[model samples]
Target: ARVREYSRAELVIGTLCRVRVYSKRPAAEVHAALEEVFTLLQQQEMVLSANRDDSALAALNAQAGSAPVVVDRSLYALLERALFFAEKSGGAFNPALGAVVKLWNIGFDRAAVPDPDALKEALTRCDFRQVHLRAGVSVGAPHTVQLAQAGMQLDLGAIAKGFLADKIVQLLTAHALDSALVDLGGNIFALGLKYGAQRLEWNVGIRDPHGTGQKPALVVSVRDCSVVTSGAYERFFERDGVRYHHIIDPVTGFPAHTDVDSVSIFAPRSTDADALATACFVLGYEKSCALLREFPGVDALFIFPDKRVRASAGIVDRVRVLDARFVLER
Candidate 1:
């Protein structure tokens, strides 16, 4: 049977989410699967969103420096994974920067350079070490998380989308779909393979950081993996000829001062890709390559402000530079 593609897009998790499936299954089944995927995303958002005061995470944040708060097993597992990345990145990809993020308020109506003293106070609460997690001791028991500081906050925005994308992939696999593409904003998971005779892999684009259009600076082919990018251009504001982007440095309590314009991480798990992209963007090109060495199957492509591009040795062959202005550095 010939494969047919089915797709759906919705506004969820504070961004436009799109999921596409290629399968020989009946249209109703495919459509139903897509619907289930979106519903799952919406429900997950209520648990994961930092912007919503009613979210489970918000509840945890509200109880900062207090008694341990029990959270869902899935969220607990995600928090554990996030802390792993935080430790590996030396706190560059901290999940406990909620206070600093709120202080800067970048990407919001009140976004501007925060007061020096307030920023300093917020930085003290940005340590990942302050977040303590305990797993359930028995079946049906609950897992708990606690913030060691009064104003400490946990912000999973850096990795939640990718974590959720992996969840979507698992759902699609359970339905026995032939192929699928899950894009949560720009975090993409190319599940299985493309459906054409010659197209064995999905050609995913790396967006041009300096461009305002839909053009990509490069493209890479992949199957059954994720491509997640964290770009300085994703969110920022200009003030007095200086640009302040959303990605913050937990140590400095300001936007990261790295030279990377954008960094895209390729990994079998979207969760890893998501956190690594943010970490690599803050770590810069050389340090990012050093960091990728710890994860055997992961690779990255770093784009610089000078239009110089660098790709990890493992993914060099997979990347094709589409824009002439951007030169691939050796």
Candidate 2:
């Protein structure tokens, strides 16, 4: 955003806010378009805010324990996509496992292990099929679907940014902007020719999932696509010298049992790449790699727990894998 004629317009979406649009369009028009994007994301945030009982997700989670609640398009749409990925990976990406998410307390940013018996009890509620729906519109689950005795919550934080980024790109496209780069909290969408294709397309950095505390893990060239990464280091807590990370394994009701330290996804849709990154982290190694076969036009990189590195054939072509210590294999 280095357009001298332009000024940054600041926006607040829930607790996270950002600056948007710097060049190639009238400041007034870009401001309005970006605001509209924020508005939609704001609407979404309100519906899923854990503190807001009226949120569609909270209400849906409530009904989920008792019965399937009639839900609005926004919540249902995300639900459908998550479930699609969930089943595609043989339960590696389930939304119905919110119970387990809370049980593990991982994404809370400062979480610890939960009681085993209680977590196991929560597992009884996770049958992704129980959270059923049709065509991304509405859903149904038996009334017996009950919240964990201790209650539970979801960590949609993973995909929320990407969804907002996608919406921003869609808004800019509708406005006829020749090209745009939308980085909504790092779930980025680069759409169209370029505000300054005459210069450079969007530049995105790949972070070290290890959080070694410096430098981009890798930098890659991208155009009109979205990049999302699920990294074990995004959030975590340590106690007794054991590290519990954000990506939880629903079936185990614990942090995901992964050899993968991180998974980055690049694809046509931010939402798809966003959630898939998390799932790939949970699936880990060969299982996650196999999951990629069902995915087309999507590519990825995996940094394993043992410091081994691998990328799908497509992504391997995108990088030189500069670090001698890092390996990229088929």
Candidate 3:
């Protein structure tokens, strides 16, 4: 029997990113495959990053105060899905919060809590509904997207990793790999169930929000599913003893004041799981559970600030909570 091993790769996503591929194949082969996935994502991300002057998104920002930016098929398709999820989440997971993110600058040395007056002004330009997409060969010669307001930033951080993870699995299946697991930073996707000494599923760890020193709050077992978590614990800063996190509210132009410490979602598609983790976190337990009705096979695990854990109907049988305060609700 060939020994199973994990191959790792690194990239700059304005945060620590690890791409791991587990397989029985030669370590070199596995690492190469992982590198390929990282390279693919790096190129795609460069085109979508608003900070890059050469990016199509940046090009649009340079145009008149507000103008439509013609993009290629790849960027256009991603934005199309971004808009759908943004609307489906009822603006709770807006990609149009670029300006607010820049203002807070969480996860970097420049991070700070903005003045209330500045936040209010930024909120005016933050709405997912203003993003428009148009494509045709007639008068419109290429695929294009327009942001209704100028100085508005359409940050894809919430969904890009999930999209990249989806693409890697597609690559693995096409390569005829028997089994593998992909970790895009914290976003994880299982390619297939692997036969190991212990069991036939991936034992994915859930990071503890209230604990310290790399503790896992729980472990989830699954095969061929995308697992994503959005949490305040991962990235944040303190101003006057108050923790200001990275997830901003579209309506308030401030960090969402949700009681949820973290939210993890499991779905067939990584993009769906990725975007929903943030959306569901903002919705909180009661509303998030109701939102799950729209997604047939999707499930969520919400961990509250008070050490309470709640799982949805679909995840009841799948998740194994490690805390004493775990609660199962409808």
Best by TM-score: 1
lDDT of 1 by residue, 59-128 (tens): 9999998999999889999999999999999988999988888877743456468888988988888878
TM-score of 3: 0.89
The collision pairs in model 2 are 65-145, 66-143, 259-305
C-alpha TM-score for every candidate? 0.97, 0.83, 0.89
- lDDT string, candidate 3, 1-330, tens digits: 476667565766555566545466777777667667677777766777766777766676565246677888878888888889888889888888877777787334655567788878878777777788899868647998888776677888888888878888887776657577788788999877766655478878887776672857678888889899988876778767888777777777767888788899999999999999988878777778778888989988887777777777666677676655655444
Q: Which stretches of candidate 3 lie over 4 Å from their true place?
A: 1-4, 22-31, 64-66, 106-108, 137-141, 197-199, 323-330
Instruction: For each of the candidates, give the backbone clash count.
Output: 0, 3, 0
lDDT of 1 at 182: 94
Among all windows of 10 consecutive residues in model 2, the one with the lowest summed lDDT is 141-150
Task: Using lDDT, give the best candidate's number.
Answer: 1
Question: Candidate 1 — number of clashing residue pairs?
Answer: 0
Candidate 1 colliding pairs = none
lDDT of 2 at 99: 67
Model 2 over residues 1-330: C-alpha lDDT tens digits?
445222233444444445345455567776776667667767867766544567766765665445345655666677677768777877777666666766555435444577788889888767766555643323653222233323344446556677667766777678755456666555667665344526555556666666563666666567778888887677678777888886777767787878777888989899889888888888887887788888878988877766566777766666655455666665
Task: Assess each prediction's global lDDT (C-alpha) against the native.
Answer: 0.89, 0.67, 0.77
lDDT of 1 at 11: 92
Please identify model 1 stretches exceeding 4 Å from their true place. 197-199
